[PDB]
Amino acid sequence: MYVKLISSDGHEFIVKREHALTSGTIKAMLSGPGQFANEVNFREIPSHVLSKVCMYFTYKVRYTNSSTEIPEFPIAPEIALELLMAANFLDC
Amino acid sequence: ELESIRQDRDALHMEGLIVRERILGADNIDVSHPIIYRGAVYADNMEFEQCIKLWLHALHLRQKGNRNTHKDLLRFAQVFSQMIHLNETVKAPDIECVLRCSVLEIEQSMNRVKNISDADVHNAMDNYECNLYTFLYLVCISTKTQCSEEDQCKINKQ
Amino acid sequence: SKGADYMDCLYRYLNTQFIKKNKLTEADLQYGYGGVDMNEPLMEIGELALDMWRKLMVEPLQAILIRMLLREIKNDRGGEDPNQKVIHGVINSF
């Protein structure tokens, strides 16, 4: 029910798996012999951007076709390019 | 034979058209001019059945060469609009397939013509939009009707 | 079959960002037609696996297989029951 994400920095983030399955790439990575039983490690992603990605997961989870205005997702200026890069490899 | 034909007007019309076709042949486009007129008269009062085949023969003869036929296409689309509005359409899609082939051919031909030169294709460009808008009209007409699987394959294929 | 499924899973990025762009649209494969080139258009990895498996193995070795399947059908008509799972899987493979 809970899945572990390990960044290249070394920090480990535990997340509800129903949240994590939003991104197709993670779903495909779990599929296959690596059934892991879970924990997942990325050799190149730094911790902070992956934390922002996790916050994106939970923020999308909170509001789905929800009524009224949806609060915008704050973006830091420098990390914008890194987020654009990291969008592909997770395909969220 | 001629004495018997003397009384019937329609037989005389058909005989005159046949004689003109036999003598003149397909050399000049003038052979097409009477036929449309004849069909027009029929189109004013008849069930339109012979009008369709007359105009199709005219289209074949004209398309055998290189002539603009956009006015003919828009007129004949008007004929379909009217006969649809009369709600007695019982439309046959095969004629639609043939005219789709004709309009698709003329589109490419005049696009090539426009590619040949640009000094005197402004009227050709206007005819380009005219043909496009007609094609929209005929697609709508095809939409308003329904028929068999092979036919929907052909209209869609074109 | 399992290898092909896992392989298709593993090439997900290549499928998503490369193949689909040059892939033939299913629409023209149906009503449009429009194709006669002497080339194999880029296809999905699993599609490659299955199409190749049909092309290179089952075609040369089909007559004897179907003959022995028909023969075993007579044996079952005699009453004896061979392994139903194997035959069912073979038929389902088609």
mmCIF file with all atom_site columns, C-alpha atoms in Angstrom, chain C:
data_model
loop_
_atom_site.group_PDB
_atom_site.id
_atom_site.type_symbol
_atom_site.label_atom_id
_atom_site.label_alt_id
_atom_site.label_comp_id
_atom_site.label_asym_id
_atom_site.label_entity_id
_atom_site.label_seq_id
_atom_site.pdbx_PDB_ins_code
_atom_site.Cartn_x
_atom_site.Cartn_y
_atom_site.Cartn_z
_atom_site.occupancy
_atom_site.B_iso_or_equiv
_atom_site.pdbx_formal_charge
_atom_site.auth_seq_id
_atom_site.auth_comp_id
_atom_site.auth_asym_id
_atom_site.auth_atom_id
_atom_site.pdbx_PDB_model_num
ATOM 1  C CA . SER C 1 1  ? 4.792   -14.211 -24.569 1.00 0.00 ? 1  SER C CA 1
ATOM 2  C CA . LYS C 1 2  ? 5.826   -13.111 -21.078 1.00 0.00 ? 2  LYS C CA 1
ATOM 3  C CA . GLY C 1 3  ? 9.178   -11.944 -22.415 1.00 0.00 ? 3  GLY C CA 1
ATOM 4  C CA . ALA C 1 4  ? 7.459   -9.865  -25.090 1.00 0.00 ? 4  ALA C CA 1
ATOM 5  C CA . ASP C 1 5  ? 5.108   -8.302  -22.546 1.00 0.00 ? 5  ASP C CA 1
ATOM 6  C CA . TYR C 1 6  ? 7.963   -7.377  -20.202 1.00 0.00 ? 6  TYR C CA 1
ATOM 7  C CA . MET C 1 7  ? 10.036  -6.111  -23.138 1.00 0.00 ? 7  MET C CA 1
ATOM 8  C CA . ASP C 1 8  ? 7.177   -3.880  -24.291 1.00 0.00 ? 8  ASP C CA 1
ATOM 9  C CA . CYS C 1 9  ? 6.956   -2.582  -20.727 1.00 0.00 ? 9  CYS C CA 1
ATOM 10 C CA . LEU C 1 10 ? 10.698  -1.872  -20.634 1.00 0.00 ? 10 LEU C CA 1
ATOM 11 C CA . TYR C 1 11 ? 10.853  0.195   -23.867 1.00 0.00 ? 11 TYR C CA 1
ATOM 12 C CA . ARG C 1 12 ? 8.069   2.551   -22.762 1.00 0.00 ? 12 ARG C CA 1
ATOM 13 C CA . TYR C 1 13 ? 9.911   5.821   -23.415 1.00 0.00 ? 13 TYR C CA 1
ATOM 14 C CA . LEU C 1 14 ? 11.075  4.709   -26.865 1.00 0.00 ? 14 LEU C CA 1
ATOM 15 C CA . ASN C 1 15 ? 7.507   3.719   -27.726 1.00 0.00 ? 15 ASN C CA 1
ATOM 16 C CA . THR C 1 16 ? 6.012   6.968   -26.450 1.00 0.00 ? 16 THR C CA 1
ATOM 17 C CA . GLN C 1 17 ? 8.441   9.562   -27.795 1.00 0.00 ? 17 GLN C CA 1
ATOM 18 C CA . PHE C 1 18 ? 9.783   7.960   -30.984 1.00 0.00 ? 18 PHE C CA 1
ATOM 19 C CA . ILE C 1 19 ? 7.652   5.235   -32.548 1.00 0.00 ? 19 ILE C CA 1
ATOM 20 C CA . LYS C 1 20 ? 4.204   6.846   -32.481 1.00 0.00 ? 20 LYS C CA 1
ATOM 21 C CA . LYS C 1 21 ? 5.389   9.886   -34.448 1.00 0.00 ? 21 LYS C CA 1
ATOM 22 C CA . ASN C 1 22 ? 6.361   7.763   -37.459 1.00 0.00 ? 22 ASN C CA 1
ATOM 23 C CA . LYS C 1 23 ? 3.772   5.053   -36.754 1.00 0.00 ? 23 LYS C CA 1
ATOM 24 C CA . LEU C 1 24 ? 1.088   4.558   -39.380 1.00 0.00 ? 24 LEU C CA 1
ATOM 25 C CA . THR C 1 25 ? -2.257  5.883   -38.184 1.00 0.00 ? 25 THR C CA 1
ATOM 26 C CA . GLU C 1 26 ? -4.873  3.150   -37.848 1.00 0.00 ? 26 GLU C CA 1
ATOM 27 C CA . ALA C 1 27 ? -7.345  5.349   -39.741 1.00 0.00 ? 27 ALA C CA 1
ATOM 28 C CA . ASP C 1 28 ? -5.495  5.118   -43.057 1.00 0.00 ? 28 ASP C CA 1
ATOM 29 C CA . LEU C 1 29 ? -4.765  1.415   -42.527 1.00 0.00 ? 29 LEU C CA 1
ATOM 30 C CA . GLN C 1 30 ? -8.558  1.022   -42.545 1.00 0.00 ? 30 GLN C CA 1
ATOM 31 C CA . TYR C 1 31 ? -10.637 3.313   -44.870 1.00 0.00 ? 31 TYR C CA 1
ATOM 32 C CA . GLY C 1 32 ? -7.734  5.329   -46.305 1.00 0.00 ? 32 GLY C CA 1
ATOM 33 C CA . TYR C 1 33 ? -5.545  2.557   -47.717 1.00 0.00 ? 33 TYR C CA 1
ATOM 34 C CA . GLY C 1 34 ? -3.058  4.790   -49.556 1.00 0.00 ? 34 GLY C CA 1
ATOM 35 C CA . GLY C 1 35 ? 0.014   2.563   -49.018 1.00 0.00 ? 35 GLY C CA 1
ATOM 36 C CA . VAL C 1 36 ? 2.108   0.409   -51.425 1.00 0.00 ? 36 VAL C CA 1
ATOM 37 C CA . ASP C 1 37 ? 5.812   1.115   -50.468 1.00 0.00 ? 37 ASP C CA 1
ATOM 38 C CA . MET C 1 38 ? 8.425   -1.657  -50.114 1.00 0.00 ? 38 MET C CA 1
ATOM 39 C CA . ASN C 1 39 ? 9.144   -0.937  -46.463 1.00 0.00 ? 39 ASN C CA 1
ATOM 40 C CA . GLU C 1 40 ? 8.089   -2.051  -43.001 1.00 0.00 ? 40 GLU C CA 1
ATOM 41 C CA . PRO C 1 41 ? 6.789   1.021   -41.139 1.00 0.00 ? 41 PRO C CA 1
ATOM 42 C CA . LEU C 1 42 ? 7.963   1.529   -37.581 1.00 0.00 ? 42 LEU C CA 1
ATOM 43 C CA . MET C 1 43 ? 5.819   -0.493  -35.184 1.00 0.00 ? 43 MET C CA 1
ATOM 44 C CA . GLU C 1 44 ? 5.459   -1.158  -31.478 1.00 0.00 ? 44 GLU C CA 1
ATOM 45 C CA . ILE C 1 45 ? 8.058   -3.380  -29.813 1.00 0.00 ? 45 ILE C CA 1
ATOM 46 C CA . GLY C 1 46 ? 5.432   -5.934  -28.847 1.00 0.00 ? 46 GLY C CA 1
ATOM 47 C CA . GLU C 1 47 ? 3.980   -5.577  -32.332 1.00 0.00 ? 47 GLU C CA 1
ATOM 48 C CA . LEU C 1 48 ? 7.413   -6.335  -33.777 1.00 0.00 ? 48 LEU C CA 1
ATOM 49 C CA . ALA C 1 49 ? 7.779   -9.364  -31.510 1.00 0.00 ? 49 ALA C CA 1
ATOM 50 C CA . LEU C 1 50 ? 4.407   -10.897 -32.377 1.00 0.00 ? 50 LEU C CA 1
ATOM 51 C CA . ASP C 1 51 ? 4.457   -10.072 -36.099 1.00 0.00 ? 51 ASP C CA 1
ATOM 52 C CA . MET C 1 52 ? 7.977   -11.489 -36.413 1.00 0.00 ? 52 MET C CA 1
ATOM 53 C CA . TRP C 1 53 ? 7.011   -14.593 -34.425 1.00 0.00 ? 53 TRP C CA 1
ATOM 54 C CA . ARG C 1 54 ? 4.186   -15.243 -36.872 1.00 0.00 ? 54 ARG C CA 1
ATOM 55 C CA . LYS C 1 55 ? 6.379   -14.451 -39.884 1.00 0.00 ? 55 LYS C CA 1
ATOM 56 C CA . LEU C 1 56 ? 9.366   -16.648 -39.065 1.00 0.00 ? 56 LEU C CA 1
ATOM 57 C CA . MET C 1 57 ? 8.139   -19.679 -37.108 1.00 0.00 ? 57 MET C CA 1
ATOM 58 C CA . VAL C 1 58 ? 4.485   -20.639 -37.468 1.00 0.00 ? 58 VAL C CA 1
ATOM 59 C CA . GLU C 1 59 ? 4.262   -20.302 -41.263 1.00 0.00 ? 59 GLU C CA 1
ATOM 60 C CA . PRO C 1 60 ? 6.878   -22.988 -42.124 1.00 0.00 ? 60 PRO C CA 1
ATOM 61 C CA . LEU C 1 61 ? 5.672   -25.382 -39.402 1.00 0.00 ? 61 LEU C CA 1
ATOM 62 C CA . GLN C 1 62 ? 1.878   -25.175 -39.609 1.00 0.00 ? 62 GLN C CA 1
ATOM 63 C CA . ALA C 1 63 ? 0.708   -28.114 -41.742 1.00 0.00 ? 63 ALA C CA 1
ATOM 64 C CA . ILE C 1 64 ? 2.125   -30.881 -39.545 1.00 0.00 ? 64 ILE C CA 1
ATOM 65 C CA . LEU C 1 65 ? 0.849   -29.170 -36.386 1.00 0.00 ? 65 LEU C CA 1
ATOM 66 C CA . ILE C 1 66 ? -2.701  -28.832 -37.698 1.00 0.00 ? 66 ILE C CA 1
ATOM 67 C CA . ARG C 1 67 ? -2.580  -32.404 -39.024 1.00 0.00 ? 67 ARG C CA 1
ATOM 68 C CA . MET C 1 68 ? -1.607  -33.813 -35.629 1.00 0.00 ? 68 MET C CA 1
ATOM 69 C CA . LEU C 1 69 ? -4.197  -31.645 -33.863 1.00 0.00 ? 69 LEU C CA 1
ATOM 70 C CA . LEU C 1 70 ? -6.901  -33.003 -36.168 1.00 0.00 ? 70 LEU C CA 1
ATOM 71 C CA . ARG C 1 71 ? -5.581  -36.521 -35.543 1.00 0.00 ? 71 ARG C CA 1
ATOM 72 C CA . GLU C 1 72 ? -5.749  -36.028 -31.764 1.00 0.00 ? 72 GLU C CA 1
ATOM 73 C CA . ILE C 1 73 ? -9.333  -34.839 -32.222 1.00 0.00 ? 73 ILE C CA 1
ATOM 74 C CA . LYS C 1 74 ? -10.148 -38.331 -33.513 1.00 0.00 ? 74 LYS C CA 1
ATOM 75 C CA . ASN C 1 75 ? -8.411  -39.834 -30.474 1.00 0.00 ? 75 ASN C CA 1
ATOM 76 C CA . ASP C 1 76 ? -10.593 -37.730 -28.179 1.00 0.00 ? 76 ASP C CA 1
ATOM 77 C CA . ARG C 1 77 ? -13.627 -38.810 -30.205 1.00 0.00 ? 77 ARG C CA 1
ATOM 78 C CA . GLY C 1 78 ? -12.504 -42.319 -29.285 1.00 0.00 ? 78 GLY C CA 1
ATOM 79 C CA . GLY C 1 79 ? -12.959 -41.346 -25.641 1.00 0.00 ? 79 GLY C CA 1
ATOM 80 C CA . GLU C 1 80 ? -9.434  -40.806 -24.345 1.00 0.00 ? 80 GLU C CA 1
ATOM 81 C CA . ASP C 1 81 ? -8.680  -37.298 -23.086 1.00 0.00 ? 81 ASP C CA 1
ATOM 82 C CA . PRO C 1 82 ? -5.214  -35.827 -23.769 1.00 0.00 ? 82 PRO C CA 1
ATOM 83 C CA . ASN C 1 83 ? -3.936  -32.738 -21.966 1.00 0.00 ? 83 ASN C CA 1
ATOM 84 C CA . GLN C 1 84 ? -6.623  -30.118 -22.580 1.00 0.00 ? 84 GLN C CA 1
ATOM 85 C CA . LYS C 1 85 ? -4.485  -27.239 -21.284 1.00 0.00 ? 85 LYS C CA 1
ATOM 86 C CA . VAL C 1 86 ? -1.750  -27.700 -23.900 1.00 0.00 ? 86 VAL C CA 1
ATOM 87 C CA . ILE C 1 87 ? -4.160  -27.962 -26.832 1.00 0.00 ? 87 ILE C CA 1
ATOM 88 C CA . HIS C 1 88 ? -6.233  -25.041 -25.548 1.00 0.00 ? 88 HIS C CA 1
ATOM 89 C CA . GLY C 1 89 ? -3.138  -22.861 -25.265 1.00 0.00 ? 89 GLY C CA 1
ATOM 90 C CA . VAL C 1 90 ? -1.968  -23.867 -28.739 1.00 0.00 ? 90 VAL C CA 1
ATOM 91 C CA . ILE C 1 91 ? -5.346  -23.001 -30.266 1.00 0.00 ? 91 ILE C CA 1
ATOM 92 C CA . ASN C 1 92 ? -5.565  -19.734 -28.310 1.00 0.00 ? 92 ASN C CA 1
ATOM 93 C CA . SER C 1 93 ? -2.120  -18.801 -29.631 1.00 0.00 ? 93 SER C CA 1
ATOM 94 C CA . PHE C 1 94 ? -3.653  -18.465 -33.104 1.00 0.00 ? 94 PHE C CA 1
#
